[PDB]
Amino acid sequence: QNQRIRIRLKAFDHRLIDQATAEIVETAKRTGAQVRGPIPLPTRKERFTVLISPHVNDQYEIRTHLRLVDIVEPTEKTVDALMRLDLAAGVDVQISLG
Amino acid sequence: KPERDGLFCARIFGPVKDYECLCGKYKRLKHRGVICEKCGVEVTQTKVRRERMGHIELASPTAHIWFLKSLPSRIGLLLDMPLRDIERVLYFESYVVIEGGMTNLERQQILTEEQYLDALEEFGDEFDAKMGAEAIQALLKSMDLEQECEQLREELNETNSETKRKKLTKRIKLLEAFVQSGNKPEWMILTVLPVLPPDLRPLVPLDGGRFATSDLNDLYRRVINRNNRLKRLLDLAAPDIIVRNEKRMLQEAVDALLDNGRRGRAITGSNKRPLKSLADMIKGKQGRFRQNLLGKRVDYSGRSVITVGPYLRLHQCGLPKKMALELFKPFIYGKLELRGLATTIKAAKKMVEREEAVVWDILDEVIREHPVLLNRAPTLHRLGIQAFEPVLIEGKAIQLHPLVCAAYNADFDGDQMAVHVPLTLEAQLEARALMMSTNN
Amino acid sequence: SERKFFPGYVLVQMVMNDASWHLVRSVPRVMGFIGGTSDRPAPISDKEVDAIMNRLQQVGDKPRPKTLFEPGEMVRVNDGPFADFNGVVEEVDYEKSRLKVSVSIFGRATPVELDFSQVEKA
Amino acid sequence: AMHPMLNIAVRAARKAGNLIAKNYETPDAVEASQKGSNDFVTNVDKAAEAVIIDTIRKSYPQHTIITEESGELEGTDQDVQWVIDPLDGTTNFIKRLPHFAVSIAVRIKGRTEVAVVYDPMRNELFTATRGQGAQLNGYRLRGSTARDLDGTILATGFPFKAKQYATTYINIVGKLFNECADFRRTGSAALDLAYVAAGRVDGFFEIGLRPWDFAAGELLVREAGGIVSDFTGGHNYMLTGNIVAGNPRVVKAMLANMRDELSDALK
Amino acid sequence: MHPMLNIAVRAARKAGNLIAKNYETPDANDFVTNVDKAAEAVIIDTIRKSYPQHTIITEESGELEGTDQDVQWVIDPLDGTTNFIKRLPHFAVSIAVRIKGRTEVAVVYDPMRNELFTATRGQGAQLNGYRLRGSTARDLDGTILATGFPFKAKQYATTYINIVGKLFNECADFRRTGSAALDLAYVAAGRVDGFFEIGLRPWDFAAGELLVREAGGIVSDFTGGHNYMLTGNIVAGNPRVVKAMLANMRDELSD
Amino acid sequence: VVKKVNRDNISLDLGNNAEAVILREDMLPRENFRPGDRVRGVLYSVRPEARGAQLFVTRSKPEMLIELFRIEVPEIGEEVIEIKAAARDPGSRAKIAVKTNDKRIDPVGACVGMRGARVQAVSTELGGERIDIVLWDDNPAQFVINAMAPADVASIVVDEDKHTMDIAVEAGNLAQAIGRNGQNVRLASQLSGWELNVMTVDDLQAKHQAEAH
DNA sequence: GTTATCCGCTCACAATGCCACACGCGCTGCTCGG
RNA sequence: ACUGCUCUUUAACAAUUUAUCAGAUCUGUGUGGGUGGCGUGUGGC
Ligand SMILES: [Mg+2]
Ligand SMILES: [Mg+2]
Ligand SMILES: [Mg+2]
Ligand SMILES: [Zn+2]
């Protein structure tokens, strides 16, 4: 069917991201989809803040490790096994088809 | 299937199939009360579609054709305004100034185009000349009831002659009756039109898909279409004269729905005849009163042609075997269940269907004293309906004593007569005691 | 698909003379005028004139897909890759026209960019 | 289907109510402070209001918002309002009395269009959208079919913020106790309105209620067969805060009974 | 204190299960009494199997005796019946076991919220494993009154109205869920500061009064006496608020 | 996803008509549900022969947290951080003690994640559940010392025959050490499975030596 | 002149009951459709 | 042709103030459920 299922992955963790991308390409291969490159784009800094009871007159800086996976042969097994196997929290999965 | 949010929508009125969701999800009595989520219908008895009513949020106020054109017009007397001007301002062809601002304009005065625009040039504010239904609504809601009531009261003891006093005592009677009851004059101008339950205006089908559109649905479709179009126009920057004419058209359509009588007609397509409005379902020889309420058709009776039968005694009357076997059927089922000759009701129905040699003895037993009512077609006076005891005969005619047939004003030119069977014990004994021929 | 600003009405730029009055009315299929009292028409005011003119200009410049989707309504999916799914429109878009839609993918809800053609009822 | 803004509102109310329940089982985390008469306001109010505002702005970054705390947050648009009470009956949540609710309604052109109240303790979810009606966890709501002031139950509230009417109020209640059967008092206007629309109590009335404490319930009782009014039969109840609500018969009877006992200040 | 309480808890469990089960036949005045009788009967079965010697005291059956007349079972299978009549879910079962002219076992169980308060004299009153420590109010400032309108004692109507008027002038706010037993349980568990009602009955408050007294509170009549057992006039709560309430409410009574 | 909620159970769907049921004890006492939500759990029981529903999922039994960490903690699932044991109090507070084979592993600095992200994610997924990650030692005394963290005990008196352990906190920390309902203690008594005793760290517990001097 | 008075003007509003039988019941050029 | 010339040895933590001694139930598918509205005309009495 139509091709470009492009997955962005914001993240603040490291090992679970490797695990997630690995099992994602694993599922793509268990389907047969022409999985494109995960292509780890350059890490993006983020000055965070602490919106709780502050200090007296800290999650302030963090490094978002990003992932760009792509599935361009979505037969039944891709979406089936993907919606079946959930992914841990702490990562953002804003996907696109277009 | 009922189109969603339509004149028959199941979500708004009720489920079509008895105790079954529309989408088909829920199908059992185990869910009496819940609403589905695929289509959102409350799975209950279909009978409720006979009861639930709908409402239409009219995109603009509109008059109620009854209180406008029912002499004497309620609004007219309630406002001391000639009906002609009220009609000319309702249908958007005039103006009415309200509250009588700094200008020399009275709160009840009307305006045409040139006067309105000239006063508008002379006064940009403190002068509110509104036109149409909502204008009259504001005019009503601004009027103080008991204030003007007591004003006219104190005034009536002041002036002459008795023609003014007559009209004014009529008006103060109206105002006193009004303020006495809980009514409020602004309710006389509809703002939300209630639409009849769907089942009471059923889209009756034909052999294929040629559903006979009952005219009520036609009128409602016309009105809701005007309303939807008018709302869409109200949203698109509202070209003033356009929306003016559209509100006029909607007012006309609603008037036609409440009563197709006044304001011309609303003829159906290619069938040159007016449509049954709501009032047309109440007034007349076909209105609910003279058609279903006062005299209702009876399910437990029959008719035939009367022969003479000059042998029966004065209280007896002939009765064909067919007619008795059809009428007293429940009594026959009861007697058969008593003697156990048919344990199940369906077995008894089969037995009556075959007319076993025992069913005739049973029938002869069950009417040995059970009276019956005979009636002539034009029942001019009290004797037009009498009570007899039936006697089984052959053929299909209804024998009756010659004397009472002289009493019925009944010849034997083929005049037909209707039969009736009083079934409750009170009615049997009543017919035996009051309307038996040996009493009249 | 073709719509109308307001059906049943037609707009003209006539003048006021009884001859022209009839000439307008003496045409195959029209009802009367729409304005002041019958036999004395009234003009659609110049403010409304320029208003409808701007509306006409806007509709003539940009042919634009209407029948939009409102943020927070459930909807099925007619997409190939995502056939027979259903989710809530998490954020709508018009020029991009690709319907940011949240839907249950691998458990938790996820936002997707399923385009207009891949959007079912509502 | 389901009204869109109604879906957003019910999701937001669900999240707020989950946060409420979370704060409930911890009589330590609540750190309140008194603001009015015989009532506190907690940090939980601020947390829930924040969650609601954020969830709304997620799918509606321009709608106007109204709240007892933040007053009126005027979004870039001003025709679509969201009247919010992250808590009705904060007094009860102080004492952990398990009877309270979150309330969210949407006004369009001044007319309430969708409304929800949510009791997290019984997991009850009163939804109501205009022209389609009110639902309790998937059941329709018709209000008590009672036809007179006999045997009825009357929900009410005592004006702990305007106790001057109390005496008058007392007389009112006294007069009503001549006819009605029993009263009800939960310290939660929204849930009182819901119960009315739920047919659980056959009538409600209160003297001097806050605007964002009924704007959700009033649509419920409207689309559940009931009607609302002030104590004089008018529509100014949105300003006076003086509410009566219930099926038409009981409302008419209550108004007829109270026409005398009432005071001219309220009318 | 263990076996009696376990038996009573199982009885309340069965009662609440049957009540909640029958709560799902929607209907819009008699069948409520029917399921009332049914729950009372299964309670009676629980009484007959376990300890057939004790005697039963119900609003419905009056008093049904056995051999051990020293152990009375005061079981109201429903309090605030009108609520269940109107599907308003605020109602509970109230089990009480009095021994030697004195209450000793008390249980109040709401099946809707699953609230199971137990109470043994001396060792106190627990809830789901938690100890009810009463209310913290020392006066009638900002407090809540579990107030009850006498819909069965209309004779004291105006007196009660004047009393609650003085109170609301002094106190802060009322509550009334239409369930005497649950009102007593709630004022016991510090959920509402003080409680007071007019014209009650032993089968109603039999357990709630103990639930309150075990929570650092007191239960009395409108004159500080101890005849509230039968006069139906009850005021309860931690002693501070009860004193602060009586000191204001005495001077407008009639009994 | 769910279909229906009752007072004793709820009904779940898994697509392709796969229907399951979740009993009351399986659920948290306050977890509000609604037809449509996408609930997760652990498939603890099956009855391929039952007269009715056959699939049984829970969220309360302690294995739920094991599986949740397994899907969260990339360390776990490969057994580089072996989950030793875990005790729970449904939806309220669940302690857990794990071990590790590798020396350079920080179970407090890894299973928690970064400034409290992993365990926080598991909790917020669980619906507001307090969690206590602690290192499992192989000595019941030191282990229960670890268990009541946060606390501090200076008088550990163990008795293995009686399964008893006097583990008493510093005077003053009790209101925090015991915690409401003795949760911090209730879980400890379950985590090691021993009938503990937390009364007094510096008096009236050393009867022999105390009364001796 | 005005104020009340009256007389012709126009419109609303009724037309026995039944029975039986028969016949018919939009459309149409714009709109959705391949 | 003519920016680039080691930065020095893989994560740096959340849970936290009374109170505790951890403290009954896995049965169905017996049973029913699974032409008409209006108009008009025609006659009859
Ligand atoms: Mg004749
Ligand atoms: Mg509030
Ligand atoms: Mg009782
Ligand atoms: Zn459905």
Side-chain angles (χ1 to χ4, degrees):
Chain A
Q1 282 277 8
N2 295 113
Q3 303 297 110
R4 303 187 169 197
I5 291 90
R6 318 173 151 274
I7 294 91
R8 320 187 192 182
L9 291 177
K10 270 189 165 194
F12 300 157
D13 197 311
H14 316 102
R15 190 171 156 181
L16 51 82
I17 276 299
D18 299 338
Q19 157 161 1
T21 54
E23 59 82 26
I24 275 162
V25 291
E26 179 270 339
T27 54
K29 298 160 179 187
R30 301 311 87 87
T31 300
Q34 296 322 110
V35 55
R36 283 306 154 276
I39 308 166
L41 70 95
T43 299
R44 309 169 303 101
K45 326 299 169 182
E46 197 279 333
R47 269 192 44 210
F48 206 56
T49 187
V50 187
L51 181 44
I52 316 171
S53 315
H55 280 87
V56 195
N57 280 26
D58 293 308
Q59 41 186 28
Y60 274 168
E61 195 272 331
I62 199 59
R63 296 189 71 244
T64 79
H65 303 60
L66 267 287
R67 290 296 176 271
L68 203 166
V69 186
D70 204 332
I71 304 309
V72 286
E73 188 43 48
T75 70
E76 298 80 8
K77 266 186 294 299
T78 285
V79 302
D80 178 76
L82 198 41
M83 77 184 293
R84 283 321 188 190
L85 170 50
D86 197 330
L87 186 45
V91 301
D92 311 347
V93 297
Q94 50 195 359
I95 66 170
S96 45
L97 178 59
Chain B
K1 280 309 181 61
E3 158 175 302
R4 194 151 65 179
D5 304 291
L7 262 290
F8 280 86
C9 170
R11 164 161 69 199
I12 185 179
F13 294 149
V16 179
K17 195 149 185 173
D18 206 329
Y19 279 110
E20 188 162 345
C21 178
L22 177 139
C23 73
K25 189 176 180 181
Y26 303 89
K27 278 170 164 29
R28 211 57 72 205
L29 299 168
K30 315 178 292 190
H31 321 75
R32 172 188 81 262
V34 63
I35 71 172
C36 166
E37 57 276 30
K38 299 172 185 300
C39 49
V41 291
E42 174 188 40
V43 52
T44 75
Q45 326 175 341
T46 290
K47 154 170 52 54
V48 72
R49 290 185 102 245
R50 185 181 270 277
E51 180 65 15
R52 302 210 218 270
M53 310 192 40
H55 80 280
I56 307 172
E57 286 278 349
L58 277 152
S60 314
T62 183
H64 189 302
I65 197 61
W66 274 12
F67 316 97
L68 179 55
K69 301 303 290 294
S70 313
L71 273 53
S73 87
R74 313 266 59 72
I75 284 187
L77 191 55
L78 192 42
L79 282 197
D80 276 328
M81 182 160 316
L83 177 142
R84 189 44 49 88
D85 301 353
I86 290 172
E87 195 163 21
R88 270 166 60 260
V89 58
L90 264 297
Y91 309 91
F92 300 76
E93 283 163 15
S94 313
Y95 277 84
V96 161
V97 59
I98 61 175
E99 298 278 2
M102 313 302 106
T103 181
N104 48 13
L105 269 297
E106 198 65 28
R107 187 181 168 268
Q108 308 285 352
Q109 189 163 333
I110 80 164
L111 294 174
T112 184
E113 297 300 328
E114 65 277 20
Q115 311 153 341
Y116 166 58
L117 56 91
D118 291 328
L120 157 67
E121 298 195 354
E122 198 183 340
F123 321 96
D125 79 317
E126 53 85 28
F127 164 79
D128 300 330
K130 290 207 162 193
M131 74 187 291
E134 64 92 16
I136 296 307
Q137 171 188 25
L139 195 43
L140 293 182
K141 191 149 59 183
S142 59
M143 176 171 65
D144 194 357
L145 289 191
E146 88 295 330
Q147 162 82 5
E148 194 148 332
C149 183
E150 66 88 22
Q151 156 176 336
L152 289 206
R153 178 54 52 99
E154 80 167 3
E155 180 271 342
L156 205 44
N157 312 86
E158 181 78 25
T159 77
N160 289 309
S161 72
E162 316 319 291
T163 179
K164 170 185 299 306
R165 296 200 71 201
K166 174 66 187 181
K167 203 196 73 177
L168 288 181
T169 190
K170 174 56 194 171
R171 189 177 190 268
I172 70 172
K173 188 179 71 184
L174 173 61
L175 275 174
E176 162 54 43
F178 205 115
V179 67
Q180 184 69 18
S181 171
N183 299 270
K184 300 215 289 181
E186 68 281 14
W187 301 342
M188 210 165 304
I189 294 316
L190 295 195
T191 304
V192 290
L193 168 65
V195 50
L196 182 82
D199 189 20
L200 310 186
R201 45 165 209 282
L203 201 71
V204 62
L206 261 54
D207 210 306
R210 287 218 73 189
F211 297 81
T213 78
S214 45
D215 313 347
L216 275 303
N217 318 91
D218 201 2
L219 290 173
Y220 270 123
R221 281 210 288 101
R222 174 182 324 277
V223 165
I224 187 173
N225 206 327
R226 303 311 160 169
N227 208 65
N228 289 30
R229 173 214 280 173
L230 193 137
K231 198 179 305 182
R232 186 205 199 158
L233 269 63
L234 262 293
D235 298 357
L236 283 199
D240 184 285
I241 295 319
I242 288 304
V243 55
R244 197 72 49 79
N245 170 78
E246 210 50 54
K247 298 209 300 177
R248 197 263 306 158
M249 165 174 307
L250 177 141
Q251 160 78 27
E252 286 279 1
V254 172
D255 291 308
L257 185 135
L258 296 206
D259 184 3
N260 201 5
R262 291 88 193 186
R263 316 296 294 163
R265 305 289 181 281
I267 312 289
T268 170
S270 305
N271 188 348
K272 308 296 183 48
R273 57 94 173 175
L275 295 187
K276 290 286 186 303
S277 172
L278 278 197
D280 305 321
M281 288 200 89
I282 295 191
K283 57 178 186 296
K285 277 208 301 299
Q286 289 80 16
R288 287 282 174 271
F289 273 149
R290 319 173 60 181
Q291 204 43 250
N292 275 333
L293 269 299
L294 288 200
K296 53 195 57 177
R297 203 168 292 257
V298 165
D299 70 345
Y300 217 72
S301 282
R303 81 188 301 102
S304 170
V305 54
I306 50 180
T307 180
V308 52
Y311 58 88
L312 50 86
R313 202 166 292 128
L314 188 49
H315 52 62
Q316 302 158 328
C317 80
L319 202 65
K321 284 199 312 174
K322 310 295 189 49
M323 275 181 40
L325 191 55
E326 209 283 339
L327 290 176
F328 296 86
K329 184 183 301 304
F331 302 85
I332 303 166
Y333 291 162
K335 285 316 178 194
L336 286 195
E337 292 267 327
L338 164 69
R339 295 185 181 188
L341 314 180
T343 42
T344 80
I345 286 307
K346 313 202 181 301
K349 297 182 180 161
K350 186 63 53 52
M351 280 193 47
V352 173
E353 180 49 66
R354 273 190 303 257
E355 303 87 26
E356 301 295 329
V358 64
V359 75
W360 301 111
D361 296 332
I362 291 299
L363 181 138
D364 209 328
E365 168 167 8
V366 78
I367 69 145
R368 196 190 206 177
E369 325 289 325
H370 190 297
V372 79
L373 264 53
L374 266 75
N375 172 37
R376 172 75 187 286
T379 89
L380 286 67
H381 61 307
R382 189 175 81 161
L383 306 189
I385 284 188
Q386 304 219 0
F388 297 78
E389 299 194 2
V391 290
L392 270 297
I393 55 175
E394 321 302 325
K396 325 292 203 41
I398 293 187
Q399 304 170 4
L400 82 167
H401 208 279
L403 315 181
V404 286
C405 94
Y408 277 124
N409 190 12
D411 48 357
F412 290 142
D413 54 324
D415 306 326
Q416 307 175 19
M417 283 196 56
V419 78
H420 290 272
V421 283
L423 71 163
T424 186
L425 185 60
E426 302 83 350
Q428 297 185 22
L429 184 36
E430 213 287 333
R432 173 161 299 280
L434 265 297
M435 46 191 45
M436 185 88 74
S437 90
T438 56
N439 304 119
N440 298 136
Chain C
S1 43
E2 162 147 9
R3 302 313 178 205
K4 310 170 173 296
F5 278 176
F6 34 89
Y9 304 106
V10 292
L11 313 166
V12 303
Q13 198 185 5
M14 73 166 196
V15 304
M16 174 60 171
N17 72 70
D18 308 67
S20 298
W21 188 98
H22 290 68
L23 294 182
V24 175
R25 204 197 194 88
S26 45
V27 299
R29 48 178 63 250
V30 300
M31 276 81 95
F33 274 157
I34 299 296
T37 183
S38 278
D39 88 350
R40 185 47 196 263
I44 171 169
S45 184
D46 198 6
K47 283 202 170 184
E48 318 278 338
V49 163
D50 67 73
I52 209 64
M53 191 62 55
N54 290 24
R55 310 296 163 157
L56 190 57
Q57 265 190 346
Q58 272 98 59
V59 63
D61 297 322
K62 37 196 77 175
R64 293 192 144 281
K66 306 296 103 178
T67 71
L68 54 95
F69 305 132
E70 292 74 4
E73 57 199 359
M74 51 195 187
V75 55
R76 283 189 31 77
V77 181
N78 56 288
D79 168 65
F82 293 83
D84 274 0
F85 280 164
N86 44 1
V88 183
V89 287
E90 201 179 354
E91 163 197 336
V92 74
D93 60 321
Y94 286 158
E95 49 276 10
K96 303 150 292 295
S97 47
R98 225 161 288 103
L99 269 299
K100 182 71 79 64
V101 161
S102 177
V103 60
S104 177
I105 317 294
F106 38 93
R108 50 161 184 196
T110 83
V112 198
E113 202 68 20
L114 301 187
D115 199 300
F116 264 100
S117 158
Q118 292 78 241
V119 191
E120 276 297 332
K121 76 180 184 89
Chain D
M2 151 177 289
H3 212 273
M5 289 193 309
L6 165 65
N7 201 309
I8 290 302
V10 60
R11 151 193 299 169
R14 281 276 292 288
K15 295 208 180 320
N18 300 1
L19 182 84
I20 291 301
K22 190 256 286 187
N23 284 275
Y24 178 73
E25 273 289 351
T26 173
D28 174 76
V30 53
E31 286 161 324
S33 314
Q34 190 160 4
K35 68 100 176 181
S37 161
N38 314 326
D39 64 317
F40 294 0
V41 167
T42 80
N43 49 5
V44 180
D45 194 328
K46 274 78 74 179
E49 172 197 333
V51 169
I52 285 181
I53 294 167
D54 296 331
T55 49
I56 281 170
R57 297 311 179 73
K58 285 213 172 192
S59 175
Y60 273 135
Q62 76 285 42
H63 279 166
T64 312
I65 303 194
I66 310 169
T67 308
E68 48 187 56
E69 295 297 327
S70 288
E72 171 171 339
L73 304 194
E74 300 87 9
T76 63
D77 204 335
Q78 56 195 358
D79 60 348
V80 187
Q81 297 178 346
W82 295 62
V83 293
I84 314 294
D85 181 8
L87 213 62
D88 179 14
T90 78
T91 312
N92 294 64
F93 180 74
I94 291 155
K95 315 191 62 71
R96 279 175 40 250
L97 199 153
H99 191 283
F100 41 78
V102 76
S103 156
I104 290 170
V106 163
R107 267 164 165 182
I108 295 179
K109 313 302 209 310
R111 163 159 60 252
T112 311
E113 202 79 26
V114 310
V116 293
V117 304
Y118 186 91
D119 165 22
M121 315 326 287
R122 307 165 188 267
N123 199 18
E124 287 188 342
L125 175 53
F126 303 74
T127 179
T129 182
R130 190 174 56 110
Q132 304 196 12
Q135 317 158 2
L136 176 145
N137 298 321
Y139 301 171
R140 284 204 87 96
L141 297 162
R142 294 316 301 163
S144 159
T145 58
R147 317 161 41 80
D148 47 358
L149 259 177
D150 188 8
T152 168
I153 319 297
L154 272 301
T156 183
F158 279 55
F160 56 85
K161 286 167 286 190
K163 305 165 84 67
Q164 59 272 16
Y165 315 91
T167 318
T168 314
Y169 183 45
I170 281 289
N171 318 329
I172 304 168
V173 193
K175 187 75 175 315
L176 267 299
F177 191 42
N178 293 118
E179 323 182 41
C180 78
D182 189 1
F183 307 88
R184 283 303 177 282
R185 181 87 180 83
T186 80
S188 82
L191 282 194
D192 287 332
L193 286 192
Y195 292 147
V196 169
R200 285 166 183 180
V201 288
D202 317 350
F204 157 85
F205 83 102
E206 198 277 345
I207 296 173
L209 187 59
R210 291 297 317 166
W212 42 74
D213 290 19
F214 54 71
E218 65 92 14
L219 189 47
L220 282 148
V221 286
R222 272 201 204 284
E223 293 282 16
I227 62 172
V228 306
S229 161
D230 51 15
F231 297 139
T232 184
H235 300 245
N236 294 348
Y237 58 84
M238 293 180 286
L239 279 189
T240 68
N242 294 319
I243 305 296
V244 67
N247 67 71
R249 295 272 181 70
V250 307
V251 164
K252 183 47 70 187
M254 289 170 67
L255 276 189
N257 186 27
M258 290 151 54
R259 175 200 64 260
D260 273 319
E261 290 285 329
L262 285 159
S263 89
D264 194 22
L266 290 172
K267 312 179 188 176
Chain E
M1 59 85 73
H2 277 314
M4 47 199 70
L5 265 64
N6 179 37
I7 298 288
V9 161
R10 160 194 155 281
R13 278 300 189 185
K14 284 294 301 178
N17 296 316
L18 269 294
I19 280 179
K21 282 279 288 300
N22 295 255
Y23 185 43
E24 303 321 301
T25 176
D27 207 47
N29 190 24
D30 55 335
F31 68 94
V32 50
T33 58
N34 303 161
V35 289
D36 187 8
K37 182 262 292 181
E40 179 262 5
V42 291
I43 285 166
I44 284 295
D45 177 77
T46 62
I47 314 162
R48 294 328 296 169
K49 164 175 54 189
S50 47
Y51 302 169
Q53 46 267 48
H54 305 168
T55 66
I56 310 98
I57 292 177
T58 79
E59 53 182 32
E60 181 157 29
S61 316
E63 182 163 21
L64 316 183
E65 309 181 44
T67 171
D68 194 328
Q69 299 188 356
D70 206 8
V71 195
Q72 305 100 18
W73 278 41
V74 174
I75 319 297
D76 193 311
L78 179 56
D79 181 38
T81 72
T82 180
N83 304 326
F84 189 83
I85 300 189
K86 298 191 148 306
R87 307 273 163 171
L88 161 63
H90 194 107
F91 47 86
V93 193
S94 63
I95 284 174
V97 166
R98 303 190 61 171
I99 292 192
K100 273 216 291 296
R102 204 191 298 262
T103 182
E104 311 300 326
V105 190
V107 166
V108 290
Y109 171 60
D110 169 80
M112 305 322 293
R113 318 162 157 283
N114 178 40
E115 311 301 337
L116 180 54
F117 316 82
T118 73
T120 175
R121 174 175 182 233
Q123 283 193 47
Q126 284 171 346
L127 160 73
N128 298 319
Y130 264 60
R131 194 48 162 274
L132 312 190
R133 263 152 170 82
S135 89
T136 79
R138 211 169 296 102
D139 45 328
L140 302 187
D141 172 71
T143 66
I144 321 296
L145 302 191
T147 304
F149 287 70
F151 85 106
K152 288 176 306 187
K154 215 156 186 186
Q155 46 273 29
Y156 279 167
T158 308
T159 71
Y160 163 86
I161 291 301
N162 307 332
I163 283 302
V164 304
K166 310 158 62 195
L167 288 178
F168 179 55
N169 299 311
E170 185 144 339
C171 82
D173 184 11
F174 305 147
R175 287 293 184 284
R176 172 160 174 74
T177 43
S179 314
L182 281 161
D183 285 325
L184 266 188
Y186 269 60
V187 63
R191 299 186 160 166
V192 56
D193 314 281
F195 160 88
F196 84 102
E197 282 188 347
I198 284 187
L200 294 190
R201 282 297 86 215
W203 45 83
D204 301 320
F205 51 68
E209 52 89 19
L210 179 65
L211 265 297
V212 165
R213 275 196 276 94
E214 298 296 337
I218 65 173
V219 300
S220 79
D221 45 34
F222 305 164
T223 70
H226 302 145
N227 200 17
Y228 55 99
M229 171 58 55
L230 300 147
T231 58
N233 294 319
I234 294 95
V235 178
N238 60 5
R240 324 282 201 183
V241 308
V242 178
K243 161 192 186 52
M245 177 180 314
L246 268 297
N248 176 276
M249 71 93 75
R250 284 184 295 110
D251 51 359
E252 290 291 327
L253 303 168
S254 157
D255 198 7
Chain F
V1 302
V2 307
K3 283 196 314 174
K4 183 201 193 82
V5 305
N6 312 325
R7 194 180 34 80
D8 49 4
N9 80 310
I10 63 182
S11 87
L12 273 65
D13 279 28
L14 310 168
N16 279 12
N17 319 327
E19 176 277 334
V21 288
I22 295 194
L23 268 294
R24 40 165 189 259
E25 66 281 25
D26 287 334
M27 296 182 287
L28 315 176
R30 67 176 210 191
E31 199 174 342
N32 303 348
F33 291 137
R34 179 78 41 192
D37 49 38
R38 318 159 194 176
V39 63
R40 267 190 304 161
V42 54
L43 191 42
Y44 70 101
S45 159
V46 70
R47 279 80 181 271
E49 73 295 336
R51 273 65 63 184
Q54 311 190 0
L55 279 186
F56 290 71
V57 185
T58 182
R59 305 174 43 98
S60 46
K61 305 194 186 55
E63 54 270 40
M64 185 55 201
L65 266 74
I66 312 180
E67 311 311 318
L68 272 168
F69 285 157
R70 203 173 293 272
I71 198 61
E72 199 286 326
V73 185
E75 288 89 340
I76 312 169
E78 298 155 349
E79 278 308 317
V80 310
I81 306 196
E82 165 176 348
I83 306 183
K84 201 72 178 189
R88 288 199 54 190
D89 187 6
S92 70
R93 184 180 204 80
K95 298 208 174 203
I96 181 154
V98 302
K99 72 161 310 303
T100 295
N101 68 318
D102 174 24
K103 282 266 296 180
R104 38 184 186 78
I105 293 301
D106 207 15
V108 61
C111 180
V112 170
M114 281 71 70
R115 65 208 175 281
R118 297 193 169 187
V119 72
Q120 186 183 32
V122 169
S123 47
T124 179
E125 212 280 345
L126 265 163
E129 196 159 21
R130 311 187 158 280
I131 302 168
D132 302 325
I133 292 169
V134 70
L135 156 70
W136 163 269
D137 191 12
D138 297 334
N139 182 0
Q142 181 44 236
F143 167 53
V144 302
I145 299 165
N146 308 134
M148 270 180 299
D152 183 288
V153 167
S155 177
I156 45 165
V157 194
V158 286
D159 284 324
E160 310 84 347
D161 48 358
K162 323 181 61 61
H163 290 283
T164 43
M165 332 181 70
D166 191 359
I167 317 296
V169 78
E170 193 274 338
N173 294 111
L174 281 77
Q176 180 207 337
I178 289 92
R180 69 171 71 155
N181 201 4
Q183 275 191 134
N184 306 117
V185 182
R186 172 68 65 91
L187 298 188
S189 45
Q190 213 284 333
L191 200 55
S192 44
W194 286 38
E195 193 169 331
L196 309 161
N197 271 104
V198 58
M199 292 79 67
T200 172
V201 74
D202 46 355
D203 48 56
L204 73 90
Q205 49 88 30
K207 298 284 97 175
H208 305 91
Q209 179 65 31
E211 195 272 329
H213 198 266

